[PDB]
Amino acid sequence: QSNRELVVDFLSYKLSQKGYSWSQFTESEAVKQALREAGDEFELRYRRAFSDLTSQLHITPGTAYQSFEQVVNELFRDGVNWGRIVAFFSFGGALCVESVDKEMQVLVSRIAAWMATYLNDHLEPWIQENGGWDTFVELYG
Amino acid sequence: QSNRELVVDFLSYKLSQKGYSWSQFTESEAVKQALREAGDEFELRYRRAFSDLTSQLHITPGTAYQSFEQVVNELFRDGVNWGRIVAFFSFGGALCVESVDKEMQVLVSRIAAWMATYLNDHLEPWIQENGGWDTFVELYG
Numbered sequence: 001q002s003n004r005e006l007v008v009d010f011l012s013y014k015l016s017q018k019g020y021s022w023s024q025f026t027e028s029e030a031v032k033q034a035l036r037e038a039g040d041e042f043e044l045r046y047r048r049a050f051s052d053l054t055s056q057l058h059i060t061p062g063t064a065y066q067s068f069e070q071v072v073n074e075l076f077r078d079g080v081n082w083g084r085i086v087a088f089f090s091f092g093g094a095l096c097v098e099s100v101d102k103e104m105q106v107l108v109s110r111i112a113a114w115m116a117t118y119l120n121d122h123l124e125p126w127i128q129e130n131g132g133w134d135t136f137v138e139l140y141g
Numbered sequence: 142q143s144n145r146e147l148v149v150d151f152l153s154y155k156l157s158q159k160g161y162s163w164s165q166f167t168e169s170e171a172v173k174q175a176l177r178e179a180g181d182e183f184e185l186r187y188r189r190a191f192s193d194l195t196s197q198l199h200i201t202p203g204t205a206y207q208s209f210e211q212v213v214n215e216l217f218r219d220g221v222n223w224g225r226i227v228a229f230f231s232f233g234g235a236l237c238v239e240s241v242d243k244e245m246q247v248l249v250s251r252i253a254a255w256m257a258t259y260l261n262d263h264l265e266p267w268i269q270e271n272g273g274w275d276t277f278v279e280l281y282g
């Protein structure tokens with residue numbers, strides 16, 4: 001049973017569950033379904049208690065795998081069980097959801113700032129000279 | 142009439158129109174509507190002619206505003222008019238849509254790889270030792 005496949009399924013489920021998209025988007029099924037459901041229950045039961053720690057944690061272009069690995073090792077210090085495996089997937093899903101949110105906001109804000117800068121320096125004088133945006137509406141509404 | 146407010150509106154409209162999302166998301170109004178509509182028609186008429194350039198250009202954490210400005214200055218070399226202003230908004234919206242798409246894929250696939258790595262190194266031996274994922278389903282599904 002492929003672990004990479006689980007990861008990919010769980011992450012898309014969580015992204016989707018939280019309302020994320022950036023595109024218009026049997027035995028193996030049974031594992032996925034139970035993992036999704038266990039991740040859901042774990043989050044309902046523990047998100048408050050997990051929340052104080054999973055607040056600021058947001059991965060950036062530079063974050064190293066080793067940092068991730070050092071942090072995750074804490075969860076498994078007293079050994080591996082299914083509960084802790086589920087916590088791991090949920091932690092991953094929450095990391096992923098949090099990073100995407102921040103990174104996307106930063107990216108779109110930068111481009112918005114670029115456009116506003118260009119408008120102000122190069123285009124606003126013309127707009128004022130040619131009737132403002134009301135003339136645009138009149139002409140092209 | 143605020144130019145920044147236009148930018149923010151146009152970008153949100155374009156992101157939404159393309160099915161982008163992270164998070165669960167009269168005077169001024171008329172300009173926005175006319176800009177949205179003009180941007181839409183511009184894209185329907187010229188997306189093929191643009192498409193050559195629309196495709197590969199994707200902004201990264203390091204892209205400099207000056208590069209953006211040098212490229213956009215070409216659109217306005219022969220002077221400013223409404224049509225070129227609309228083209229500018231659509232260009233910005235296409236840049237934004239394309240960058241978000243790529244950066245999100247990169248981010249999510251990096252976190253997926255991290256999780257898959259951690260599973261394989263630290264957890265897979267235990268999983269195999271304790272009945273595989275079918276035992277997880279029996280126990281917690």
Ligand SMILES: Cc1cc(C(=O)NS(=O)(=O)c2ccc(N[C@H](CCN(C)C)CSc3ccccc3)c([N+](=O)[O-])c2)ccc1-c1cccc2c(CCCOc3cccc4ccccc34)c(C(=O)O)nn12
Binds near residue numbers: 050075086
């Ligand atoms: C991980 C865990 C496991 C169990 C457990 O109960 N494990 S279980 O008995 O195996 C089991 C039982 C039931 C089910 N499922 C049922 C579903 C039945 N439904 C079909 C009805 C219930 S839903 C459910 C319930 C529980 C688990 C799964 C699903 C399953 N399951 O599905 O796998 C398994 C209980 C509590 C905790 C737990 C929660 C929060 C923190 C924490 C720590 C702190 C150290 C980490 O440091 C960090 C601290 C803070 C932040 C960090 C961030 C990152 C890294 C480390 C961090 C430790 C620890 O000390 O390790 N433990 N926790």
Ligand SMILES: Cc1cc(C(=O)NS(=O)(=O)c2ccc(N[C@H](CCN(C)C)CSc3ccccc3)c([N+](=O)[O-])c2)ccc1-c1cccc2c(CCCOc3cccc4ccccc34)c(C(=O)O)nn12
Binds near residue numbers: 179223225
């Ligand atoms: C910009 C443009 C404007 C018009 C125009 O027609 N302008 S218009 O007459 O003012 C007008 C008419 C109608 C409306 N609207 C109606 C809506 C009516 N509905 C109410 C029914 C029609 S929809 C509509 C239609 C048109 C515009 C808007 C909306 C409006 N309008 O709304 O604003 C205004 C026609 C064609 C083009 C045009 C298209 C594609 C490429 C290109 C270039 C190459 C750049 C080379 O530089 C670079 C070189 C190299 C690399 C580069 C990289 C990046 C940039 C530039 C680069 C140049 C150029 O070289 O300039 N021009 N183009």
